[PDB]
Structures are given as structure tokens and as C-alpha cells.
Design brief:
The chain has no helices and 14 strands. The protein is mainly beta. The chain binds calcium ion (3 copies). One calcium ion binds next to loops. Ca(2+) 3 binds at residues 102, 104, 134, 142, 194.
């Protein structure tokens, strides 16, 4: 059977509601006198009443701003009986996909990671891996994040003893001169702006790390 073309709607619509879309209707009204209704979540079920369908005509409409993070796609189903309450057309399916929008800053799991790194270690050594997550869609720039170190402290010897794999997020050293008696531990702030690190559309957020130099 031919399948009904999916309506794609982005969350956080700005109304006014009800918004207009498709007009699902049966060609029986060519002599008959139909009447419609919808079913399934958003219709006659939780959120009950988000998708309404003008009994007559068939305009299919949505009554509120949506959010992909609660329900991404809707599997509604339209029906049609004639005024003598028969049943002329088998219920047809309808899919309302909800498209992603970057409306979720990235969280960092632990807001305070900890770790160590040996005494005076050769550069490029691996110290620890911090990570973050983003509720927005993963195969999307709204869910693709990148990490960077905003600050280090103490500021000596070199005010940049570490680095962090912009993609995977594991701290690495690039400078030498680590001495647990000259500096027992470091405190770094870690940012993780999303949108593929994009600075003017990515939503940032932070967490910090304490690197304990091993003796
Ligand atoms: Ca949301
Ligand atoms: Ca985001
Ligand atoms: Ca989202």
C-alpha cells in the first residue's frame, strides 16, 4: 500500500495554535458524507489532545509547542465513518516526526573529575579523560560537542602544562616540569561547547578537574 507522507515538525514551535498542516480525507465523500477523527498518543491518548482533526473536512492540526526530548515521532491513525456511523475507510497511519533544535546545554556527568599524573613526566603523556553528554540529537550538530580547557591553576611553571583532545576529551601534557613538591595538584576548568565546537551557536557548559602529581 502507498504510504502517507510524514509531516516533519520542529519542537518549540511559536504558535499560534492550532498550527495547520495536512488535510487527510477519504475520496468516498464523492457521494457519501464522511466524518473523521484521530487516534494514538497526542490524539485520543497521552498527551491526549495535541493533535486534533476537524471532524468534517480533515484538516489535521497540532495544538501546542512540541519537544523531541519527550516524544520524537508520533504514530497517529486517521479514521472515517459516514453519518450513519458505518466505516468506509480502514484506519490509515500518520507519522509526525519531530525534528531537533539545539535547546539543551551539554551536561558533564561529574561536575568535578579528579586524577593524577606522575612526577616530571615526559610530554604528550595521558593524564585523565573527562567527558560530557548532550540531550539534543547525536547525529546532529545540536548533539555534537567538543572540549577545551579554559583555565589552569597554578599558573606555573608554564601556564599551559596540559591539553585536551578536542574530540574525545582526555587531558594530555605538552609541557614538562611537573614536580610534586613544586606543585602537588592542578585545578583546570573544562568547557564543552556543542554545535561541533562552533563558538557562536554552540551552547557551552563546564566542569573542573584536579590533577594530582604522583611522587
Ligand atoms: Ca528540549
Ligand atoms: Ca546542545
Ligand atoms: Ca533538542
Amino acid at each position: 500500500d502507498w504510504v502517507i507522507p510524514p509531516i516533519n515538525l520542529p519542537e518549540n514551535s511559536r504558535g499560534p495554535f492550532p498550527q495547520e498542516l495536512v488535510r487527510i480525507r477519504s475520496d468516498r465523500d464523492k457521494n457519501l458524507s464522511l466524518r473523521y477523527s484521530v487516534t494514538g498518543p497526542g490524539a485520543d491518548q497521552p498527551p491526549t489532545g495535541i493533535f486534533i482533526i476537524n471532524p468534517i473536512s480533515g484538516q489535521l492540526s497540532v495544538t501546542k509547542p512540541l519537544d523531541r526530548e519527550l516524544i520524537a515521532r508520533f504514530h497517529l491513525r486517521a479514521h472515517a465513518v459516514d453519518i450513519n456511523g458505518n466505516q468506509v475507510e480502514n484506519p490509515i497511519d500518520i507519522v509526525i516526526n519531530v525534528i531537533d533544535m539545539n535547546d539543551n546545554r551539554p551536561e558533564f556527568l561529574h561536575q568535578v573529575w579528579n586524577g593524577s599524573v606522575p612526577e616530571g613526566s615526559k610530554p604528550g603523556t595521558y593524564v585523565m579523560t573527562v567527558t560530557a553528554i548532550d540531550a539534543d540529537d547525536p547525529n546532529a550538530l545540536n548533539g555534537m560537542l567538543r572540549y577545551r580547557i579554559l583555565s589552569q591553576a597554578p599558573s606555573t611553571p608554564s601556564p599551559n602544562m596540559f591539553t585536551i583532545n578536542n574530540e574525545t576529551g582526555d587531558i594530555i601534557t605538552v609541557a614538562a616540569g611537573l614536580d610534586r613538591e613544586k606543585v602537588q595538584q592542578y585545578t583546570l576548568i573544562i568547557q564543552a561547547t556543542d554545535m561541533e565546537g562552533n563558538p557562536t551557536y554552540g551552547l557551552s557548559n563546564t566542569a573542573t578537574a584536579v590533577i594530582t602529581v604522583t611522587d
